Amino acid sequence: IVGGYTCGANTVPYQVSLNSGYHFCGGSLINSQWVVSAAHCYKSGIQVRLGEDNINVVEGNEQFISASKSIVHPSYNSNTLNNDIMLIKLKSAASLSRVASISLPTSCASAGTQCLISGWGNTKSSGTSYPDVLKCLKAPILSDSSCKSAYPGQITSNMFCAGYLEGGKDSCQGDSGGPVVCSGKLQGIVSWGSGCAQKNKPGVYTKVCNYVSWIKQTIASN
Amino acid sequence: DFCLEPPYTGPCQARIIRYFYNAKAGLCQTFVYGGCRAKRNNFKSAEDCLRTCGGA
Ligand SMILES: [Ca+2]
Numbered sequence: 001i002v003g004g005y006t007c008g009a010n011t012v013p014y015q016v017s018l019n020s021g022y023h024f025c026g027g028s029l030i031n032s033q034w035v036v037s038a039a040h041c042y043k044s045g046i047q048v049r050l051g052e053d054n055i056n057v058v059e060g061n062e063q064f065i066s067a068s069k070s071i072v073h074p075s076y077n078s079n080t081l082n083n084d085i086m087l088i089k090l091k092s093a094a095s096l097s098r099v100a101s102i103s104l105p106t107s108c109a110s111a112g113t114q115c116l117i118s119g120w121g122n123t124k125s126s127g128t129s130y131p132d133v134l135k136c137l138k139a140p141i142l143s144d145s146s147c148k149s150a151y152p153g154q155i156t157s158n159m160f161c162a163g164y165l166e167g168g169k170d171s172c173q174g175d176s177g178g179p180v181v182c183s184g185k186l187q188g189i190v191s192w193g194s195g196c197a198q199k200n201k202p203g204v205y206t207k208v209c210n211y212v213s214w215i216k217q218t219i220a221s222n
Numbered sequence: 223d224f225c226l227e228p229p230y231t232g233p234c235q236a237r238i239i240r241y242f243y244n245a246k247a248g249l250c251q252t253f254v255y256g257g258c259r260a261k262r263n264n265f266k267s268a269e270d271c272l273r274t275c276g277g278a
Contacts, residue, residue, distance in 0.1 A: 025236045040234045040257035078258055081234070121235060173256055174237035192233040192258070
């Protein structure tokens with residue numbers, strides 16, 4: 001997260017870290033045994049870390065649980081990045097104030113809605129600086145038109161832009177799969193962008209409201 | 223020769239550590255790959271990297 005602020009220990013209870021020997025992506029806890037993240041974060045041997053703040057030191061509120069199943073959306077396209085969504089089943093159920101699930105949206109959010117994006121990704125636009133603690137960023141959802149003018153012929157109906165056209169505030173490498181929560185509902189998944197915090201290049205997110213049925217049914221039949 | 227190409231992080235935002243052949247140094251080094259749109263000078267281990275590009 002570039003241009004954000006320290007969230008504060010366990011203030012984002014649904015935020016998880018996907019670890020494969022080191023933090024490589026974020027994710028959201030939407031059920032005591034399920035996590036939602038990005039399809040491009042698919043990797044074998046994933047260990048999910050919950051109740052994390054400082055990802056580098058064991059503080060005592062953590063729960064490390066390995067994944068038993070990783071289900072990438074059947075229509076995920078690695079070239080176009082369309083349907084960049086994945087579900088991870090925990091090997092055992094998490095014990096749910098510091099660890100809690102986030103609700104799925106009942107409906108899609110509108111342009112202008114303010115959302116909270118969080119993660120342990122790079123905090124520099126020109127450079128590399130990964131934080132110990134979780135960073136937060138409040139960014140508004142942008143209209144489909146400006147998103148499309150920012151990324152010509154790249155935005156699908158399953159993606160939305162959020163951020164600032166002036167730049168300086170954005171998600172970045174290491175934030176993928178993390179939550180974009182608006183009005184207490186999970187509306188997006190950190191997905192892609194062009195650099196980080198660049199002017200006229202807002203971040204692109206997976207539009208979660210479009211997958212709620214697939215999510216609920218997939219969780220129930222696995 | 224794709225072995226001479228600079229490492230490509232790509233548009234996605236994961237922080238996945240991969241290897242690329244650094245012809246200037248004559249060795250495989252690590253870099254951060256974003257998770258999508260990988261170019262060919264991007265390997266999962268130093269051994270794969272050396273086997274494909276070693277000596278380029
Ligand atoms: Ca910790």
